[PDB]
């Protein structure tokens, strides 16, 4: 997260860290046994880390559970990043409490202007590489589809939305991928892509979760 702030230990209880000997992506706990992330984060040998703040120290409240299966959306395109969504089933159910809780799926799409909270352990520098120990947060509004498409001509599909600041300096970045974009207590987006990080007139593009609610539910019901 570039231009964000330290969230505070366990203030984003649904935030998940995808680990394979190091943190590579974020995710969101949608129920005791299912995590939603980005398809481009797919990797074998995934350990899901719940209740995390400092990802390098065992401080208490953590829960490490192996992923039993990772379901990448069947129509995911690695070139366009369209349908950039993946579901992860936990080997065991997570112990829900005050510091580990699930986030609600949207019942409707969010409109332009809505302020959302984006979080993660990704890169914090626009020009360079710096990874934090603790979780960073960023509040950013959803932009208009016209603006989004003016920024990324021919690359924005109906399953994506832009969020952030056109002036630059505040945006999600590498390592944040798969993480949550929560608006009004509902998971509206998943950190997907963007041209660089925090660049002028290049906001972040996120997977439009409201278009996948039925898919998620059906897929979960059948697995
Ligand atoms: C591995 C992976 O899928 N990806 C896709 C997602 N990737 C990126 O978007 C990267 C870094 C990144 C990651 C997450 C959010 C942002 C943001 N600006 N909000 C930027 N930005 S980039 O300019 O290097 C970039 C942009 C679009 C891309 C589209 C396809 C492939 C690579 C791409 C790289 C990481 C590699
Ligand atoms: Ca820790």
């Amino acid at each position: 997260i570039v231009g964000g702030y330290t969230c505070g230990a366990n203030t984003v209880p649904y935030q998940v860290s995808l680990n394979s000997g190091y943190h590579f992506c974020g995710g969101s706990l949608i129920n005791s046994q299912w995590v939603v992330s980005a398809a481009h984060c797919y990797k074998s040998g995934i350990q899901v880390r719940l209740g995390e703040d400092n990802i390098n120290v065992v401080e208490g409240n953590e829960q490490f559970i192996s992923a039993s299966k990772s379901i990448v959306h069947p129509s995911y395109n690695s070139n366009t990043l369209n349908n950039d969504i993946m579901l992860i089933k936990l080997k065991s159910a997570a112990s829900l409490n005050s510091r580990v809780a699930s986030i609600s799926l949207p019942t409707s799409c969010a409109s332009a202007g809505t302020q959302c909270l984006i979080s993660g352990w990704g890169n914090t520098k626009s020009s360079g590489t710096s990874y934090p120990d603790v979780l960073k947060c960023l509040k950013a509004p959803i932009l208009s589809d016209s603006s989004c498409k003016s920024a990324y001509p021919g690359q924005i599909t109906s399953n994506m939305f832009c969020a952030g600041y056109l002036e630059g300096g505040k945006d999600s970045c590498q390592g944040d991928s798969g993480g949550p974009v929560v608006c009004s207590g509902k998971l509206q987006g998943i950190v997907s892509w963007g041209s660089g990080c925090a660049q002028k007139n290049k906001p972040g593009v996120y997977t439009k979760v409201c278009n996948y609610v039925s898919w998620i539910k059906q897929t979960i019901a059948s697995n």
Side-chain angles (χ1 to χ4, degrees), residues 52 54-55 57-59 62:
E52 288 280 21
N54 182 320
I55 52 166
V57 176
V58 171
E59 323 166 271
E62 303 99 344

Side-chain angles (χ1 to χ4, degrees), residues 5-12 53 135 137:
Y5 61 93
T6 299
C7 307
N10 307 298
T11 51
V12 187
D53 191 39
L135 188 67
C137 278

